[PDB]
Amino acid sequence: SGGTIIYQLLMFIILLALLRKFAWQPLMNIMKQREEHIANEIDQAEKRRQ
Amino acid sequence: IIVIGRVGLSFFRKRNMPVILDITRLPDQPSFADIKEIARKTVGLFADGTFDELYMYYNHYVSAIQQEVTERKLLPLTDLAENKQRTVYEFEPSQEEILDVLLPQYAESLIYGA
Amino acid sequence: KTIHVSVVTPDGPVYEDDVEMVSVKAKSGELGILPGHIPLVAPLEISAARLKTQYIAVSGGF
Amino acid sequence: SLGVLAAAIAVGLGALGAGIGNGLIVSRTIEGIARQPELRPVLQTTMFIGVALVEALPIIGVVFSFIYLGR
Amino acid sequence: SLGVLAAAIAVGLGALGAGIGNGLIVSRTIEGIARQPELRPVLQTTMFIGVALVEALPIIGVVFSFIYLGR
Amino acid sequence: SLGVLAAAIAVGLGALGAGIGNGLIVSRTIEGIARQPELRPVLQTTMFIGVALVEALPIIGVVFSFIYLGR
Amino acid sequence: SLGVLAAAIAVGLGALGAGIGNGLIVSRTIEGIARQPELRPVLQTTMFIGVALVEALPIIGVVFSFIYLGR
Amino acid sequence: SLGVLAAAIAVGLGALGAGIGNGLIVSRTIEGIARQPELRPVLQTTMFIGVALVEALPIIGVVFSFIYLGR
Amino acid sequence: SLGVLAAAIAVGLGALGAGIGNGLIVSRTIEGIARQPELRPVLQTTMFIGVALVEALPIIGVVFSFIYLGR
Amino acid sequence: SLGVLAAAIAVGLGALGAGIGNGLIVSRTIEGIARQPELRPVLQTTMFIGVALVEALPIIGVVFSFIYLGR
Amino acid sequence: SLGVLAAAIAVGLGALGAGIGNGLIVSRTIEGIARQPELRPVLQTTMFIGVALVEALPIIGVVFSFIYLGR
Amino acid sequence: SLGVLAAAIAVGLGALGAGIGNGLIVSRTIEGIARQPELRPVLQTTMFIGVALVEALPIIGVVFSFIYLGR
Amino acid sequence: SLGVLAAAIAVGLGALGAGIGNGLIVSRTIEGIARQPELRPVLQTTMFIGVALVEALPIIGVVFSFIYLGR
Amino acid sequence: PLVEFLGLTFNLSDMLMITITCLIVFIIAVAATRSLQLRPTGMQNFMEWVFDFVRGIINSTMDWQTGGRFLTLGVTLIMYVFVANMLGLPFSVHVNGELWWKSPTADATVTLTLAVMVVALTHYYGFPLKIIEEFANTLTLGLRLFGNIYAGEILLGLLASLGTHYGAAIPMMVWQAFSIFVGTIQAFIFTMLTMVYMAHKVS
């Protein structure tokens, strides 16, 4: 078997671990910002009509 | 204190307050020359780092009867309002040099309009 | 085509006409103005304004 | 033998110099007619005499490339 | 036997000169349409004739490279 | 033997010219959409036709690079 | 033997052209966001768009250099 | 034989491209922080992003120079 | 023989230098008579003496290329 | 044989890139300190880190030239 | 032997340097006359001594090209 | 045999890089002292530390070209 | 035998770098003259020490070129 | 690393990578579009964000009434090229044969036929200088995506071999983060230039 496969796959896994410690906080906050923004657009629209 | 007039000058000399600039005995119908030299001295004395701000005090001609008293802030130009059609110029040396030469003239025109 | 000149003092308007070439000089240097010019601001030096003719000497000036 | 790439380096360097100089001239003439449009014929006539003045020497470089290739 | 190297440096230097010249002309003309929009057609025509000049010298460079590789 | 190096200088000089031309065009359209951001499509279409020019002459250069390679 | 430095001048001129084009674009983006901070997301967006466009044609020179090293 | 010359001109043209691009972007960010000094962290962070994106292709030029040296 | 390569190179670099210098002088005189058109003859005449001054030495290189082609 | 020519062309291209890039950075920072002279330490720290980058890629270019000279 | 192309590449690089330097200085004399046309004597005398300065080292190079051609 | 030509291209490229770098630095400091005349000593001290800072690597390129001439 | 080529390219690259550097410094020192007349002595003293700086390395280059031709 | 083709006509491994990227794109699409929800959350908000992103790009290039049709071609094109660039990075396996399962976009024929398919579509919905500019922009788009993926593929592979044969984790880590950056930037410039030529030929 080749040696490069498990080597670069292991470092891809540890790169995803570093990107998990670094990167789950921004994009989940971007998705939460979009979700709260569209919930306020909809929620606001519903509230005002009533 | 920068007085324009003899009445205010004698007022602040009776009450012992420091008066730098003084201008005395204007015409009934004043042109831009006399107020130009004292407004140039005033704005250049702001530019020396002395005043750090200054205010005007005059009687606004609302009507023939009213003549309300206004406190107007001359410098710095923080309360500057935007016009209708905001257009962009090509600042020919640079914008900072034309501001360096132009904002004293705006302050002098404010003093002459007041 | 012509461009509309109006030299304005705090004391009042001095000159107002339609002049083809305006040849004022700034603090940097000369400026030759034709109709269709770019919007620009430039402070004038204490010298004559060449309007092509009638020459207007300005003081202060902008 | 090597006269063909002699001819070709002559044409290539002449084309590079003509390209850079002509690009500078044309770029300044369109920003000139952009900032004030009323002088388009004057600026185009002096631009065309300028580009003829630039490419005068690469064209004689091309005919010198011809007599290099013939060598 | 160096005609392939000849034609290739000719096409390469012509491409470099045309790239820099076209980059200068197009960059200054989009600055010209950016500072004022209302004569974009006036700017574009002089831009295209400048592109025509600064590529028409490397176009005859490319044709001369073809007759270089032919020899 | 030398056709490989011929194709190589052809693609290298084409890449250098296209890189400088595209860099100039996109640089000045960055400052164009920074001065006046409401002019983004009228800057963008002229940007892409300039990119088309400054690539399209090195693109026919790199198309010719393979027939340089074969010989 | 000659294909090695063929591939080398190809990747070198590609790196040179991409470096100059990327430098022009990125430098103008950061001076544009220095002019005003309110448009730095759209200027970073068009920055990466520009970096891709000027780093695109040198990398085809890179992979063609690998083709040249193959032959 | 030619591999060491190949490696050297590859890393040298990579150094030239990275030097010109980094010089442009760093020079414009220091004139940007000289223009508005309260924008210094945003300007230098986008400048380091620019250092990475102008030294993308010279760094791959360096490892391909090691490939060229190995052959 | 190699004197043909000598002469062509001299002719090519003279054309490149004259092209860049003439492009600079003509492009800046386009801007100069574009900003103040009433001055046009005196600055175009000193532009022409600058043209003769910037292409004096490439004509000397052309004559020396005739000498080198003779050798 | 070719190793000394390799080492020297690597040092030469690294020196030329460092010279142009550091010249751009130092020139713009002294004109920036000419604009606002109260920003001396910020401009000096930023020019020092920018020069550190622009030098440090030809620094590894120079040590790679040393291992080219060894081979 | 190859001293003829030695002499010619000395002539060519001297012509390129003199062309770029003379083009820059005489172009910005045109720009300075356009800014202020009443200092034409002092601008032209500083122009011509700058022309002497930029032209001096290529003329020294071309007389050494004469001493190089012989050898 | 090639060590003398190696030392020559090393000193020459270091000279060209130092020339462009010192030209940029002294040119921008001469317009800087042309703008604010009372800033002359600070501008000269930063200019001379910049000149030494940009000729740092060309002079070590020269003293490495000496051992290139030896080896 | 190639020492003549070595010395000639050393002189040529020194002349090209000195030409660009002197062109930059003389060009915007006459811009500084044209903006204001009264600083002519300090502008010319900084000018000539800049000429000394951008010509010093070039001078070293031509002396070392004579050393190379002696080798 | 030769072109392993079981059939003489066509590359077998490229067809395998096209099938696996079509199935993974289809299953992430149906996983993001499971049910209808008026309050977006989970992955449906992500699919709607990509949908409005493509729409925004269309709105930048053309009028919304003309370019409204292209939205569902554009979103599957950006997601298809996105996953097709990111497949080459994790595994890139080597078998005892020539080569198997690198990535689809590294094959030049795949990217050039995808670019000429794009331009065939924008001719279908829509004088020698114009047609040579057309063939120029086709081949520069295909060569753009092909080169900017294939150079990174070769570099990553080279790094993998240098590590396995004989300490070198962080250079390939920095390069691999830069390579997923190159993948998403190349997908975005590919779909954006697609919509630019679509807007240029429609209106």
Side-chain angles (χ1 to χ4, degrees), chain J residues 33-49:
Chain J
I33 202 169
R35 288 180 184 268
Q36 292 179 356
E38 298 294 327
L39 296 174
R40 182 178 67 189
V42 178
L43 284 168
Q44 284 185 356
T45 55
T46 52
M47 72 176 284
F48 284 165
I49 57 97

mmCIF file of all heavy atoms in Angstrom, chain J residues 33-49:
data_model
loop_
_atom_site.group_PDB
_atom_site.id
_atom_site.type_symbol
_atom_site.label_atom_id
_atom_site.label_comp_id
_atom_site.label_asym_id
_atom_site.label_seq_id
_atom_site.Cartn_x
_atom_site.Cartn_y
_atom_site.Cartn_z
ATOM 1 N N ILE J 33 5.531 60.347 5.836
ATOM 2 C CA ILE J 33 6.017 61.124 6.971
ATOM 3 C C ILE J 33 6.236 62.581 6.571
ATOM 4 O O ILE J 33 6.302 63.457 7.440
ATOM 5 C CB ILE J 33 7.285 60.476 7.562
ATOM 6 C CG1 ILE J 33 7.517 60.912 9.003
ATOM 7 C CG2 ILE J 33 8.511 60.860 6.803
ATOM 8 C CD1 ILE J 33 8.590 60.113 9.687
ATOM 9 N N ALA J 34 6.319 62.875 5.271
ATOM 10 C CA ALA J 34 6.301 64.264 4.832
ATOM 11 C C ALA J 34 4.906 64.867 4.946
ATOM 12 O O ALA J 34 4.777 66.067 5.211
ATOM 13 C CB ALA J 34 6.808 64.371 3.396
ATOM 14 N N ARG J 35 3.859 64.064 4.740
ATOM 15 C CA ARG J 35 2.499 64.566 4.922
ATOM 16 C C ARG J 35 2.201 64.833 6.392
ATOM 17 O O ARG J 35 1.896 65.964 6.781
ATOM 18 C CB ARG J 35 1.483 63.586 4.339
ATOM 19 C CG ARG J 35 1.470 63.539 2.824
ATOM 20 C CD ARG J 35 0.448 62.544 2.309
ATOM 21 N NE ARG J 35 0.490 62.436 0.854
ATOM 22 C CZ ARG J 35 -0.259 63.160 0.030
ATOM 23 N NH1 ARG J 35 -1.128 64.034 0.517
ATOM 24 N NH2 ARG J 35 -0.151 62.999 -1.281
ATOM 25 N N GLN J 36 2.287 63.800 7.231
ATOM 26 C CA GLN J 36 1.968 63.906 8.656
ATOM 27 C C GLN J 36 3.159 63.428 9.473
ATOM 28 O O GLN J 36 3.285 62.228 9.762
ATOM 29 C CB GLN J 36 0.710 63.110 8.990
ATOM 30 C CG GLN J 36 -0.547 63.691 8.370
ATOM 31 C CD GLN J 36 -1.787 62.888 8.691
ATOM 32 O OE1 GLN J 36 -1.713 61.839 9.326
ATOM 33 N NE2 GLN J 36 -2.940 63.380 8.255
ATOM 34 N N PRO J 37 4.047 64.336 9.893
ATOM 35 C CA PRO J 37 5.279 63.917 10.579
ATOM 36 C C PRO J 37 5.091 63.467 12.016
ATOM 37 O O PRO J 37 6.077 63.082 12.653
ATOM 38 C CB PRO J 37 6.148 65.176 10.524
ATOM 39 C CG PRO J 37 5.175 66.291 10.458
ATOM 40 C CD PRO J 37 4.012 65.788 9.661
ATOM 41 N N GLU J 38 3.879 63.503 12.560
ATOM 42 C CA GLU J 38 3.661 63.016 13.912
ATOM 43 C C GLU J 38 3.460 61.508 13.965
ATOM 44 O O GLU J 38 3.323 60.955 15.060
ATOM 45 C CB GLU J 38 2.458 63.726 14.534
ATOM 46 C CG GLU J 38 2.643 65.231 14.672
ATOM 47 C CD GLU J 38 3.741 65.610 15.650
ATOM 48 O OE1 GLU J 38 3.936 64.884 16.648
ATOM 49 O OE2 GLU J 38 4.413 66.636 15.418
ATOM 50 N N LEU J 39 3.451 60.836 12.816
ATOM 51 C CA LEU J 39 3.249 59.396 12.725
ATOM 52 C C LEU J 39 4.552 58.667 12.408
ATOM 53 O O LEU J 39 4.564 57.697 11.652
ATOM 54 C CB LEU J 39 2.195 59.071 11.673
ATOM 55 C CG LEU J 39 0.791 59.589 11.969
ATOM 56 C CD1 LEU J 39 -0.115 59.319 10.788
ATOM 57 C CD2 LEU J 39 0.243 58.947 13.230
ATOM 58 N N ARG J 40 5.659 59.144 12.976
ATOM 59 C CA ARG J 40 6.959 58.518 12.734
ATOM 60 C C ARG J 40 7.082 57.076 13.234
ATOM 61 O O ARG J 40 7.528 56.227 12.439
ATOM 62 C CB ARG J 40 8.070 59.414 13.302
ATOM 63 C CG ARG J 40 9.478 58.891 13.074
ATOM 64 C CD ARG J 40 10.518 59.854 13.622
ATOM 65 N NE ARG J 40 10.470 59.945 15.079
ATOM 66 C CZ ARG J 40 11.143 60.842 15.796
ATOM 67 N NH1 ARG J 40 11.918 61.732 15.191
ATOM 68 N NH2 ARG J 40 11.041 60.849 17.118
ATOM 69 N N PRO J 41 6.726 56.709 14.487
ATOM 70 C CA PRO J 41 6.975 55.315 14.900
ATOM 71 C C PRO J 41 6.075 54.300 14.221
ATOM 72 O O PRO J 41 6.533 53.183 13.951
ATOM 73 C CB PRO J 41 6.726 55.340 16.414
ATOM 74 C CG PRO J 41 6.819 56.748 16.802
ATOM 75 C CD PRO J 41 6.236 57.479 15.650
ATOM 76 N N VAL J 42 4.826 54.662 13.918
ATOM 77 C CA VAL J 42 3.916 53.735 13.251
ATOM 78 C C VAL J 42 4.392 53.452 11.832
ATOM 79 O O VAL J 42 4.454 52.291 11.398
ATOM 80 C CB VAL J 42 2.485 54.300 13.265
ATOM 81 C CG1 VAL J 42 1.536 53.369 12.542
ATOM 82 C CG2 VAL J 42 2.027 54.533 14.691
ATOM 83 N N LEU J 43 4.769 54.510 11.107
ATOM 84 C CA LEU J 43 5.319 54.358 9.764
ATOM 85 C C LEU J 43 6.628 53.582 9.772
ATOM 86 O O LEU J 43 6.866 52.763 8.879
ATOM 87 C CB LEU J 43 5.514 55.728 9.118
ATOM 88 C CG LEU J 43 4.264 56.442 8.607
ATOM 89 C CD1 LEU J 43 4.575 57.883 8.279
ATOM 90 C CD2 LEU J 43 3.773 55.745 7.364
ATOM 91 N N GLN J 44 7.469 53.784 10.794
ATOM 92 C CA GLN J 44 8.739 53.062 10.826
ATOM 93 C C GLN J 44 8.555 51.584 11.157
ATOM 94 O O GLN J 44 9.225 50.730 10.564
ATOM 95 C CB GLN J 44 9.717 53.724 11.792
ATOM 96 C CG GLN J 44 10.327 54.996 11.235
ATOM 97 C CD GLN J 44 11.387 55.582 12.140
ATOM 98 O OE1 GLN J 44 11.635 55.076 13.234
ATOM 99 N NE2 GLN J 44 12.026 56.652 11.685
ATOM 100 N N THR J 45 7.637 51.248 12.070
ATOM 101 C CA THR J 45 7.396 49.833 12.355
ATOM 102 C C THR J 45 6.748 49.127 11.168
ATOM 103 O O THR J 45 7.104 47.981 10.847
ATOM 104 C CB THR J 45 6.531 49.670 13.604
ATOM 105 O OG1 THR J 45 5.318 50.416 13.455
ATOM 106 C CG2 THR J 45 7.284 50.123 14.848
ATOM 107 N N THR J 46 5.833 49.808 10.472
ATOM 108 C CA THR J 46 5.186 49.172 9.330
ATOM 109 C C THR J 46 6.132 49.045 8.138
ATOM 110 O O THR J 46 6.113 48.020 7.442
ATOM 111 C CB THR J 46 3.920 49.931 8.956
ATOM 112 O OG1 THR J 46 4.229 51.318 8.786
ATOM 113 C CG2 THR J 46 2.849 49.753 10.017
ATOM 114 N N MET J 47 7.000 50.043 7.907
ATOM 115 C CA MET J 47 7.987 49.883 6.844
ATOM 116 C C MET J 47 9.017 48.823 7.209
ATOM 117 O O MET J 47 9.498 48.121 6.319
ATOM 118 C CB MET J 47 8.691 51.208 6.501
ATOM 119 C CG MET J 47 9.674 51.708 7.545
ATOM 120 S SD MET J 47 10.662 53.178 7.236
ATOM 121 C CE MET J 47 11.884 52.523 6.115
ATOM 122 N N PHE J 48 9.306 48.624 8.503
ATOM 123 C CA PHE J 48 10.275 47.601 8.867
ATOM 124 C C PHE J 48 9.706 46.203 8.683
ATOM 125 O O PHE J 48 10.411 45.313 8.196
ATOM 126 C CB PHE J 48 10.766 47.812 10.296
ATOM 127 C CG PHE J 48 11.755 48.937 10.434
ATOM 128 C CD1 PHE J 48 12.055 49.463 11.679
ATOM 129 C CD2 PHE J 48 12.389 49.465 9.318
ATOM 130 C CE1 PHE J 48 12.964 50.495 11.809
ATOM 131 C CE2 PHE J 48 13.297 50.496 9.441
ATOM 132 C CZ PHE J 48 13.585 51.012 10.687
ATOM 133 N N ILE J 49 8.427 45.993 9.005
ATOM 134 C CA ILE J 49 7.883 44.651 8.775
ATOM 135 C C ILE J 49 7.646 44.399 7.282
ATOM 136 O O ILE J 49 7.840 43.267 6.798
ATOM 137 C CB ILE J 49 6.624 44.405 9.637
ATOM 138 C CG1 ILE J 49 5.526 45.442 9.405
ATOM 139 C CG2 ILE J 49 6.992 44.368 11.108
ATOM 140 C CD1 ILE J 49 4.454 45.021 8.433
#
